[PDB]
Design an enzyme around this catalytic site. Sequence first.
Site, PDB file in Angstrom:
ATOM      1  CB  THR F  95      -0.945   0.056   1.210  1.00 15.34           C
ATOM      2  OG1 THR F  95      -0.179   0.284   2.399  1.00 15.34           O
ATOM      3  CG2 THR F  95      -1.733  -1.240   1.345  1.00 15.34           C
ATOM      4  CG  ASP F 401      -0.274  -4.524   6.182  1.00 13.50           C
ATOM      5  OD1 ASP F 401      -1.514  -4.508   5.986  1.00 13.50           O
ATOM      6  OD2 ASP F 401       0.466  -3.588   5.821  1.00 13.50           O
TER       7      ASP F 401
HETATM    8  N1  LIG Z   1      14.931  -5.399   5.965  1.00 17.85           N
HETATM    9  C1  LIG Z   1      14.815  -4.795   4.756  1.00 17.85           C
HETATM   10  N2  LIG Z   1      15.912  -4.569   3.992  1.00 17.85           N
HETATM   11  C2  LIG Z   1      15.829  -3.972   2.785  1.00 17.85           C
HETATM   12  N3  LIG Z   1      14.667  -3.559   2.249  1.00 17.85           N
HETATM   13  C3  LIG Z   1      13.490  -3.721   2.902  1.00 17.85           C
HETATM   14  C4  LIG Z   1      13.496  -4.364   4.225  1.00 17.85           C
HETATM   15  N4  LIG Z   1      12.217  -4.399   4.639  1.00 17.85           N
HETATM   16  C5  LIG Z   1      11.458  -3.828   3.672  1.00 17.85           C
HETATM   17  N5  LIG Z   1      12.218  -3.429   2.635  1.00 17.85           N
HETATM   18  C6  LIG Z   1      11.738  -2.761   1.403  1.00 17.85           C
HETATM   19  O1  LIG Z   1      10.990  -1.611   1.796  1.00 17.85           O
HETATM   20  C7  LIG Z   1       9.617  -1.724   1.434  1.00 17.85           C
HETATM   21  C8  LIG Z   1       8.772  -1.856   2.695  1.00 17.85           C
HETATM   22  O2  LIG Z   1       7.948  -0.700   2.803  1.00 17.85           O
HETATM   23  P1  LIG Z   1       6.693  -0.680   3.802  1.00 17.85           P
HETATM   24  O3  LIG Z   1       6.828   0.499   4.739  1.00 17.85           O
HETATM   25  O4  LIG Z   1       6.553  -2.071   4.370  1.00 17.85           O
HETATM   26  O5  LIG Z   1       5.450  -0.347   2.829  1.00 17.85           O
HETATM   27  P2  LIG Z   1       4.845  -1.329   1.704  1.00 17.85           P
HETATM   28  O6  LIG Z   1       3.423  -1.525   2.158  1.00 17.85           O
HETATM   29  O7  LIG Z   1       4.967  -0.555   0.418  1.00 17.85           O
HETATM   30  O8  LIG Z   1       5.693  -2.569   1.748  1.00 17.85           O
HETATM   31  C9  LIG Z   1       9.501  -2.930   0.515  1.00 17.85           C
HETATM   32  O9  LIG Z   1       9.328  -2.489  -0.835  1.00 17.85           O
HETATM   33  C10 LIG Z   1      10.814  -3.675   0.619  1.00 17.85           C
HETATM   34  O10 LIG Z   1      11.353  -3.912  -0.683  1.00 17.85           O
HETATM   35  F1  BEF Z   2       3.593   0.096   4.670  1.00 16.94           F
HETATM   36 BE1  BEF Z   2       3.040  -1.432   3.961  1.00 16.94          BE
HETATM   37  F2  BEF Z   2       1.427  -1.552   3.248  1.00 16.94           F
HETATM   38  F3  BEF Z   2       3.897  -2.935   4.317  1.00 16.94           F
END
Ligand SMILES: Nc1ncnc2c1ncn2[C@@H]1O[C@H](COP(=O)(O)OP(=O)(O)O)[C@@H](O)[C@H]1O
Ligand code: BEF
Lengths: 44, 539, 96, 104, 513, 535, 100
Positions: F95, F401
Amino acid sequence: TAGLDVNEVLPNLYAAHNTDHLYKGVDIDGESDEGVKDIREENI
Amino acid sequence: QLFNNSRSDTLFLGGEKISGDDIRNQNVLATMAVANVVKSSLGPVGLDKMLVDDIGDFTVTNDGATILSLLDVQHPAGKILVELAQQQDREIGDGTTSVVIIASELLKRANELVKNKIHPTTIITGFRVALREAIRFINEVLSTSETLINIAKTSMSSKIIGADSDFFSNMVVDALLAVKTQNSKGEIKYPVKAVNVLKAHGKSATESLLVPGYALNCTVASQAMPKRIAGGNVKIACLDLNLQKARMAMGVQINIDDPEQLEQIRKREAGIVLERVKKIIDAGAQVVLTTKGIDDLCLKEFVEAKIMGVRRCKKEDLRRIARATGATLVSSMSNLEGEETFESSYLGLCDEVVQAKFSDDECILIKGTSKHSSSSIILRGANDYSLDEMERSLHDSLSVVKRTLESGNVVPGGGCVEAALNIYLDNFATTVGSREQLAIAEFAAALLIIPKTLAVNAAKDSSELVAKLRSYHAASQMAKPEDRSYRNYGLDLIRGKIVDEIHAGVLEPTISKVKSLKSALEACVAILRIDTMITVDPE
Amino acid sequence: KTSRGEIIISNDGHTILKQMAILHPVARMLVEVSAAQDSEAGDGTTSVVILTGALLGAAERLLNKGIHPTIIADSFQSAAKRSVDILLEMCHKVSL
Amino acid sequence: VQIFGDQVTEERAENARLSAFVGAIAVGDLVKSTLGPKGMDKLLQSASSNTCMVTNDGATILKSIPLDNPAAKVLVNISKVQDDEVGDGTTSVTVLSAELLREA
Amino acid sequence: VFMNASQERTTGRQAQISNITAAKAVADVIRTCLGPKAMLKMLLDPMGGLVLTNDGHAILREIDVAHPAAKSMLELSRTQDEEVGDGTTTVIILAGEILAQCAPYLIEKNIHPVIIIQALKKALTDALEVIKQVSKPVDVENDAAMKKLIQASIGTKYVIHWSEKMCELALDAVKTVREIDIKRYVRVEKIPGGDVLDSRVLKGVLLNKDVVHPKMSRHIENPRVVLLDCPLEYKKGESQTNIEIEKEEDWNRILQIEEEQVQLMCEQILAVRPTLVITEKGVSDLAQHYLLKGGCSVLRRVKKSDNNRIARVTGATIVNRVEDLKESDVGTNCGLFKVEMIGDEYFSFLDNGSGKACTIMLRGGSKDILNEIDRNLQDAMAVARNVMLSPSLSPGGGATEMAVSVKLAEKAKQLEGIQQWPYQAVADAMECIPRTLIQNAGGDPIRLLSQLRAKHAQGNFTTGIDGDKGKIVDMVSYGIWEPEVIKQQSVKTAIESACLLLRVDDIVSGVRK
Amino acid sequence: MGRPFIIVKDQGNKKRQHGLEAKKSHILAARSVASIIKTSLGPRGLDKILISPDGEITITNDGATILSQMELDNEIAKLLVQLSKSQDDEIGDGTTGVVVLASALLDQALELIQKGIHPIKIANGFDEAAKLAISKLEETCDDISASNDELFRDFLLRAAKTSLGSKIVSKDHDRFAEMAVEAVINVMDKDRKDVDFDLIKMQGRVGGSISDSKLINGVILDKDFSHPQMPKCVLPKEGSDGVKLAILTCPFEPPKPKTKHKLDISSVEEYQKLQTYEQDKFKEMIDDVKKAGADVVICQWGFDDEANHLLLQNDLPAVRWVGGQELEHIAISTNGRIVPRFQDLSKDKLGTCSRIYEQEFGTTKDRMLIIEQSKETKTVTCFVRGSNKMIVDEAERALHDSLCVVRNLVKDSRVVYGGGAAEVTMSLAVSEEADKQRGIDQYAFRGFAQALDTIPMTLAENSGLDPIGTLSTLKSKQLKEKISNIGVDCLGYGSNDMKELFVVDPFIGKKQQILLATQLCRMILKIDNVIISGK
Amino acid sequence: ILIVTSNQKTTISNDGATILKLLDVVHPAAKTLVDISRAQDAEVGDGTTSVTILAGELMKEAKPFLEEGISSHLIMKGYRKAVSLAVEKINELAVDITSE
Ligand SMILES: Nc1ncnc2c1ncn2[C@@H]1O[C@H](COP(=O)(O)OP(=O)(O)O)[C@@H](O)[C@H]1O
Ligand code: BEF
Ligand SMILES: Nc1ncnc2c1ncn2[C@@H]1O[C@H](COP(=O)(O)OP(=O)(O)O)[C@@H](O)[C@H]1O
Ligand SMILES: Nc1ncnc2c1ncn2[C@@H]1O[C@H](COP(=O)(O)OP(=O)(O)O)[C@@H](O)[C@H]1O
Ligand code: BEF
Ligand code: BEF
Ligand code: BEF
Ligand code: BEF
Ligand code: BEF
Ligand SMILES: [Mg+2]
Ligand SMILES: [Mg+2]
Ligand SMILES: [Mg+2]
């Protein structure tokens, strides 16, 4: 309503109405811009 | 045409901006607004309007610029056509209504090429081409010339005195033809408004009597003076300085220290005047015309001497009486030596100075000038609204005669100068080619507005005359050298058939059609160059 | 159309900018640049503004890409120095 | 270019941190006098009813007074939680809660 | 904005109607004020006076009109009065039924205005030649034949009761201002009460001033008269003179200069052996002593226009400069000077050689109804002055108008075509005066217009309507003849009118400037 | 020729955004929306604290949530709310980045439009470019279908781990992840590969720490025992190995018909025959349960006062008033059946349990009824606890989520590697084929890929590294090597190897997080004439 | 086009009938163009946009004749046959595809 000379149609319409005179009444278009039409024949 | 939204990025004050298409349109709409009011008023079959002051006070007229002057115009691109309408009335005098309606259709059509796809620079280059070719064509279709009595009468129809056109024809022609003057060592021009026009509500329209002298709208200041002086060789004193008692010159003050000087100084304030009055009477002056004041003190000197003497008269009038009777305007008389003398040769010779009673109003007539012919027109009629317009209708008709006399060329009007340009330019369109073609093509057909509305205003059908007129003008381009014998041109609207407007007597002046289009272009050019307007609210 | 009432129709860029009512202080800076081009050339008052608008757009993308503006500003002015040099070498002289 | 509706507030990073801190520290600095043996009581009074209460229980202070600052309303709840989960330590929770954010 | 907004545009037949509507409904407010059986429309003015008369132009003059076509119509009875005097009623009724009989019947049959104007312009050139050929020239100085003129032109408004006196007052007023006249050398000082049979044209001037000093005579046999265009006190320096006193004596010497300056005037005034002295400006309280010892009754502050009136009667000329008072400037042959007293207020008379100015003393029954007589005498003095200029007389009482009808009814048939319809409707228009004259009388108009139109074709020009009877009458035998210029101008402007308003097809409202 | 006219209704209250100057106002709108969220992406993200008109507090990271709360007005922003709202439904995770990509794509378009390009050609250029990105991802994505049972259960944890580390739950994301995987295995029919979220109940009670958040193999109710004297614990009768439950949908109240009724008692003795029916109709209810052999009664409607005490006497712990949805969950976790009337109760329609205990949920608050199991049951209640109302809610929002990324992995058992890597491979693959596209689209493809690079840059940004540096190190190391699984060490370990680092994003996740962006991006571009009414 | 109706209903479309319906046309002569597009959606489905376009441009190219003194009765007596000839042009131009 047809856009014709009011002053030139009415005298031409009265003149032709003074027994085949009984049928003569005004018509529309450019050839009839001359005047009238034999109403007995147009189914009017 | 939804009211536009102010941008979320730009930040302009007490001011908004409309761009590209929104403006281009708003200009054409406002241009048509101005033009369409005064289309009804075009042609002999054209009519007049009634313009309420708001107090009920009004003016009735045809003269386009005066109608446009009067309408409260709010849009820039409206007031531009109005600014041109008057720029006409100061460079030709007539044609004010035409020039506005031409400019409008030039814009309107020009836009409908942009509202297609064609760029404005293309069209503006395509209008430049046509105009260079139209004026070159006009000069090759002008006729250099009795004839003045037509040019007058053509500017009579379309206005109130067109019903009595023949009278107000020979009025106009003779009135002007009698103020010929040279300037700048050879310029022989007929003065822009030297014929003093007066209008008094009485009698008939036909009984408006031309003066074989000059009309002064003043009276014999003192009632005991002679209200007439007649017979050959009458002497007139054209004055400019006032005949009253002076405050101590300017920087002059009075300190009476010897009482006896009270009456000495006070009495001498009379003398200087009475001495200047004497130097006028004793010069052999029978009639006095003074721009500035006359004292009651100096009237009793004229009265007893039987000198018919006017006070407070327009200096504009007095100089045209100076140039006509022989007189010289007297600003103040001081000789080679300091002495204040007044030689007898200063005065103007005439026939009569008669104060004539017109419809509850007397005014002085200087009859039969000696030094040069002089002419004045005293209009008569129903009421003030009546007179007002037939004075404005004269100013338009005296004008077209002036420009004929100033420029040795006339055009066969009646919309055949226009109609001929339609097909000539349309055929010239192929000589260039490309996209620039539609431009000239729209211009050639944008000239249709004159011959079109003339015949619309008759109420009956237009296209009958309009297209059948074009064929006759399309009969001059396929017409051989010898075979001329096919060449003819013109339009009639009362009877409603195509007539030879040179033989018919329909004549507009040369410039009246050049400075007509010349302006009309630099109007729509400026408006077509407009792509963004930024309007900023008052201080 | 003037705050005061007068109608102005123009193409001269400094004449366009001075007479519209620009409010944003930084946007008003643009008028000053356009004025300064008139007071150095009289021509190019339009060119000079558009360039600022595309140079700023440039600067924007660089700030998006995380470059300290001080570096941007100085290297943009290092971009001037090398460019005006080019115009001076590429130009063909004129018999006065 | 505005995004939100009217009467909408956007406190971003630099300013959001200000609210967060100022809100917590304000709440902490309100109950600090409740803590300890030689500690003092607050006099809470509502505008409604003409009622009041003379209290120490840190929760009863925080649960009562109205607040706008979200960061404050966070610590207000954690005070209720402690009163629910232990009964005592309401004030201790909030002060240590704030002092951590003060040191942040 | 596009134009200006707040602008009501009336266009086409829509605008045309508004003009003919108003112009014809203008005639309506005066239709019942035509001729002898006519009435008195009593009017309330704006700031509180009262006017109640017949005199057409005096009724309209006190009405405020907004719709421009009627503002054009009313300010058209003004042209008429300012030219002839009588006929101000007629003009508007014709102006109406030229636009009424002519326009709607034929503008709503598609005929274009500009053809109609040319058609109605010819109908005037024709109409004038008709009036001038049906009229008969008259002796202007057959004193008794001219009284029949005036007798007819007053036989309309409330003054009829005493026509015999009025005509003598009118004719004798114009007789002593005649080389040709101006009836504004004729002060008409209205004095309330008595009766009309007390009104007397004085070959002279009447003043409302009393003798400035008691001892001065209120009766002088044959007074030698001096007229003055200047004040009778010491004048000041027009050069802003100011006096700076140093020595003790200085004061009295100056303060007597002004005492002496007047004696220098009085010595110069009295040096022409006068007995009367009248000034336009005010007279000093020391000037009276030296003019008492001069034997001269002095009159102060008298109207500028009253001086030119007196100087014409007495024969003396007015002079501003006292220094140059000549032997000519004295009043030879003024037969009397008196100060008779007409109940409370003092009036100064100047009675008895060659007069050229005159004062009409009027007496009535109120200050209010006096005005309504002056409105009748002004209309009387006018019809007398017309004739001395234009010696010819039309046979009136509807007769001159009907003459124009069948002459134009013949010319129209002999014209034919399209130009005929408007032309045959000025002929239609003329009969409107007979039509309203039968009406105001009270007879059947159709029945009497019939026995008028046909009884005109082979029954002489002078066949019109008798007011009080409501029957056909040969106006030769009756004695109603209106001056020729009335019938001339009446038809002239009334058409010039209808042909100004027809040119209107558009009314733009809210124009400014 | 000028008439003031009325074309559209209430014309005075209708503003019109026109042409380019409108598109600027549209893209920049989305831009601003982006700046609000871009700082909340990744494990180094930060949270948005939104307040409701009433004054309720939310503290989140779930992009959809963030955008759902804010009172928005600009029509383009309003659209992006629904863009994130869309993703949450279709997937559950992603999202946040969905919006970032969309705005960056719209930005890239704005840069190209000011270069004089038709937007419908740009949108068409984007979609043909988006269809090349998803194809390269499908070609390179790793697969857990060819895995053993031991490794499949690990990859699901790795995804849960990734989805969680971003939100304040990161503290116990070993525990929190091991909840998300456990939940999906239990409830989704293997061969249908379909998981119901109406089956997994989210429950939240405030207290203690988020560490104390357990998964319970049954249900937790807000109900007490019907009579206070009744015991807290319920132990299975030794020889049965289960508790047995009387699941009922009828009240412990004398039976009354549905259609309107009345008695018409005239005889006193017949009112006595009614009086001795009341007590008897009760005893015939308790015997009916006792003879069915049930140990605990759980009933939907309410027990009568007389029926409660006879439920105590005969040792039958009872649960007054139980929810309709909640009964459905009991009957499925206990293996039992739902029983309309007393006559229909049988020892076969009983609910088997391992324990029923009234837990002191709070220290002072209220008691709760836990029905647990030692065996795996089709419904599973996920009890989240925390130190604060706002942590509780956000933890539930973190599990949901996390639970979703595992549900997506049961549907599509294929994986790609995050940390930008996935976005980078696509950017690289679209980039190389841009020169092979040529013509007009050559700029559009170049755009699409360049806008994609904002995801890794704004990751590197938030994490505290150079945006160009991380991008030019990363894109280059993905060409010099054959590997396409090279990313950013957002946490801060030595390697860039997303494989060895267990940063794992589902496949459908990434794909949908592109198609939804490019499609909506096409919709905005298609718009050029805008007509807005008044408020 | 992106239309936001008086009730906050936001719609995006290319469907002519949908654009002209969501636009509240009050002018009684311009309400003809909404009914002209509505009939096209009822009988066909497609064309909705094109019909209005055609409708306007006919009225637009009839203005130059009306500006001159021409009766509207004669203009539409010339359009009535032109459309009845436009249909005859299509009928002979329509390809029966089952054949080829
Ligand atoms: N431990 C990590 N190391 C590197 N990249 C990460 C890690 N955790 C998440 N990500 C990257 O960051 C993003 C996570 O964003 P997040 O705040 O969870 O919103 P979304 O709902 O878009 O995933 C993902 O696109 C992922 O590729
Ligand atoms: F911030 Be997300 F929809 F993992
Ligand atoms: N008798 C006539 N017959 C045909 N055309 C005429 C006649 N009189 C004038 N015109 C034409 O009409 C025009 C006069 O325009 P007018 O309505 O008076 O306003 P303006 O002169 O201000 O344009 C001239 O250009 C001339 O060509
Ligand atoms: N006794 C009368 N009988 C018939 N007609 C008369 C008589 N007296 C006057 N008239 C006619 O009526 C006109 C006078 O009417 P009046 O109301 O004075 O109108 P105006 O004010 O226009 O003169 C005269 O012009 C005359 O033709
Ligand atoms: F209407 Be115009 F100036 F002859
Ligand atoms: F528009 Be520029 F300064 F030539
Ligand atoms: F302020 Be406490 F809960 F002792
Ligand atoms: F009534 Be009137 F003008 F003699
Ligand atoms: F715009 Be449509 F209904 F093909
Ligand atoms: Mg003219
Ligand atoms: Mg995530
Ligand atoms: Mg279609």
